[PDB]
Amino acid sequence: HGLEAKKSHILAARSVASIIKTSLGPRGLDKILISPDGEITITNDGATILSQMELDNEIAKLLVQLSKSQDDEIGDGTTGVVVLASALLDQALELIQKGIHPIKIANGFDEAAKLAISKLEETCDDISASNDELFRDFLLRAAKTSLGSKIVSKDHDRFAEMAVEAVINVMDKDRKDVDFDLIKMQGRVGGSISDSKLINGVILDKDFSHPQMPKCVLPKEGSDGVKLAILTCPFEPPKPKKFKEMIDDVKKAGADVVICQWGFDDEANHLLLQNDLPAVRWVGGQELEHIAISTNGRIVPRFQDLSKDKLGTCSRIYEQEFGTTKDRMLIIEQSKETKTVTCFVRGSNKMIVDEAERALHDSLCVVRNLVKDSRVVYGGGAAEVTMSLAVSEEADKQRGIDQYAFRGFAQALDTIPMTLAENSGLDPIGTLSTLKSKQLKEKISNIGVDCLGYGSNDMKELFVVDPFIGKKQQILLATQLCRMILKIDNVIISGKD
């Protein structure tokens, strides 16, 4: 009912949020998770941790529903939105006891969020319009923060450049569109992380069938790229609802390698060996689309529809042996910028591969937001303190019932710097009051809580920046979620039959 569920929805959100409060930031907790498919990995990513949490309460299920959609937009702000949304519910509980309707709190946070956006933009700084020479160092040092809690922190200098080229290639300067389906994340057991290379094309996990076939494709006296064949029909003699006739269509078209969705016979490897034509077997339907896009090819439905214009052309095809692994996969690169980039990471253990793989994927999401908006803001707690002081000062100028809705929004933003202060071994109240005094009597600037060990304030010297579009996306989803929670006053749970 009204007098019941309204009180229970606040306590239900504090129970789930209190688990990830200690996991926020680089000093947080790396939780051990076991997937039902058999994959074992350890990471602090909120999107993975919250997805593995399964409970019957309907208040915490909205966190998974929001993080599922946020995983595609950012994915690294899951821990930031849940804590920020829980802070709004804590301040909303006091407003209910004062006689304020819950629908007023929903509209109160809407005007408070939009007002704080204009205040953050005035104090925001830009990269391209200020210093171009430091544009390279901004993208390299941004991934170092997320990679400092992992074994990658030793070799982080090498992987910092790999995450920059992977994001830029799959996007356009004017469009600034990056898709996660265009970025393939793969890895295998064996080797180390220092041997990881960037791949500009698909993988397919092919050994080139018989070993006598050439492991490297030659340009064949300055031809046009490397022609590959795409077949949507299985390899077999035609039957109503031949091997020498189908190989001639490949030789006339100039395709060096043939890719098919279905398996081949043993005679196929015998005829393709004499002509030095490697074969590819068992390719999924989704992988067929990424090949024609990167190699600028076409989909040929029939056998006789082949031609030089419909064959995908790449830079070269070579088989590089990786450690002692017997897979011996392939690497297809391209000189021109393609729409598909595949990242490949190696590790000495299966748990190390999955640990560095998702850590590198998180760096791809941070750079994705940095290139989307050239203007960036200073993070580490300085963003929440600056946005809170602007709303708290403008709260007295805004009269009416919403005056208290603006004060509660400013106190809710202070939860983030106090949470990071509790994980860093500092007084959350003493540090919060210290950050407000440095930004008022001295001068207006951005000084946040210290995530890494240092001897003073003013992290601006460390050049730690966060994307403006990334921080703005967090406060919009936290406000939209807090309004949706207040729109459900009743929980109907049916029994089991």
């Binding site: 200690t22 790396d30 939780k31 997937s35 399964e54």
Partner: protein, 444 residues
């Protein structure tokens, strides 16, 4: 709820192996539901892997102990106990000591550097007079063979493992030394042989002694080697052609032959333990040795296998690092001084966290004196006073009960072994201190 279960649950893991540490330690017994599988062994890796544990935090120390067993194979008990003592003291550092949990982590990080610097300043190696370096390998081999039944004949076994490593002069890989275990005879009857004794014969009826043989792994060869079996007719045809075929060659045997040879001067077949053996002779710069241990029963041999494999794995690492340190409670006592030395200048919240690490270093020799029948608080305190100011030589004696020098008694330790224990145990404790909650998904 999770911190209370993780701290107490991890101490119970160390309480199982607490009696397996040290040469004076005791054996732990386990019993399954069938009651006929009970086995008495002091192996720390066997106790941790056999006992099931429902504590998810306790499973972390099990996988970490497996990594420590692959590098050396010994000292796995000291890593678990040291990791448990850090968690036992962490309970007092959190509740009543008003210390942030991350500060406890940063406290062990600054304390680990002081412990490694104490071992570096105390590491002394002698490049000249290789005879003195050979004696150091004898004393180290005595500490590795400790806690095992081989301690009886260990005095005779000291020169067996020491002279074996000196015959390698090359890569640290242990595939050169093949262990063969034959029933009958006393343990002291074991000998060192470089002739590569093979446990399998060759051919149905073929001459035993072969001269000027050419080993070919699969031409004009006098010896043939195949991985699979051999059909009847060619086995008879190979005899008429003078080619001797070898069968039942596994993947481990092929890798050992690639490190020796091909050709060999003499292949002699001998009979020991009621089974045909093959002792090769006249190889080309043979780097491989063969140790044949003679036990009374299968249970004695099964425990001697991993006992000798773990002893030779530590001696193999002594070739790359010649620096040695004094053990027997002396190594942990010297590192305890460096922790209190760096405690002079320290912050407020990190002071009690680092000082707790100093008392944890003295908990390892405390248990060593417990299983020795002596008084730990009485004997360690008398040694701590001498090590406190200067003149640090002597260490804990587990036999007479007084304070005696470890160099005079022949007790030393390798520098590479101690730096691996302080490292892995520190990383093992930092993982459990970070976890304040455990969430398990619904199984299917």
């Amino acid at each position: 709820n999770a911190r209370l279960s993780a701290f107490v649950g991890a101490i119970a893991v160390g309480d199982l192996v607490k009696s397996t540490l040290g040469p004076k330690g005791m054996d732990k017994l386990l019993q399954s539901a069938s009651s006929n599988t009970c086995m008495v062994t002091n192996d720390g890796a066997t106790i941790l892997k056999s006992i099931p544990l429902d504590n998810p935090a306790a499973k972390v120390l099990v996988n970490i102990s497996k990594v420590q067993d692959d590098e050396v194979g010994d000292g796995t008990t000291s890593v678990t106990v040291l990791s448990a003592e850090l968690l036992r003291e962490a309970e007092k550092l959190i509740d009543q000591s008003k210390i942030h949990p991350q500060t406890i982590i940063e406290g062990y990080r600054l304390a680990s550097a002081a412990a490694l610097d104490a071992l570096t300043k105390a590491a002394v190696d002698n490049s000249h007079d290789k005879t003195m370096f050979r004696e150091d390998l004898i004393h180290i081999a005595k500490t590795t063979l400790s806690s095992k039944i081989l301690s009886q004949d260990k005095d005779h076994f000291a020169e067996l493992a020491t002279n074996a490593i000196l015959r390698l002069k090359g890569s640290t890989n242990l595939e050169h030394i093949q262990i063969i275990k034959i029933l009958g005879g006393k343990l002291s009857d074991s000998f060192l042989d470089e002739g590569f004794i093979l446990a399998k014969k060759f051919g149905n009826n073929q001459p035993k002694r072969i001269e000027n043989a050419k080993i070919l792994i699969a031409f004009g060869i006098n010896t043939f080697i195949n991985r699979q079996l051999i059909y009847d007719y060619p086995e008879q045809l190979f005899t008429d052609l003078g080619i001797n075929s070898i069968e039942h060659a596994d993947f481990e045997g092929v890798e050992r032959l690639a490190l020796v040879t091909g050709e060999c001067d003499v292949i002699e077949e001998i009979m020991l333990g009621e089974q045909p053996f093959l002792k090769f002779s006249g190889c080309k710069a043979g780097e491989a040795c063969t140790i044949v241990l003679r036990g009374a029963t299968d249970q004695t041999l099964d425990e001697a296998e991993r006992s000798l494999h773990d002893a030779l794995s530590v001696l193999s690492q002594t070739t790359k690092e010649t620096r040695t340190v004094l053990g027997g409670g002396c190594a942990e006592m010297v590192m305890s001084k460096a922790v209190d030395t760096e405690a002079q200048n320290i912050d407020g919240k990190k002071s009690l966290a680092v000082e707790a690490f100093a008392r944890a270093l003295r908990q390892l020799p405390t248990i060593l004196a417990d299983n020795a029948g002596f008084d730990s608080s009485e004997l360690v305190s008398k040694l701590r006073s001498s090590i406190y100011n200067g003149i640090s030589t002597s260490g804990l004696d587990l036999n007479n009960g007084t304070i005696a020098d470890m160099r005079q008694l022949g007790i030393v330790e390798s520098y590479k072994l101690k730096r691996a224990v302080v490292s892995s145990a520190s990383e093992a404790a930092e993982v459990l201190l970070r976890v304040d909650n455990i969430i398990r998904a619904r199984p299917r």
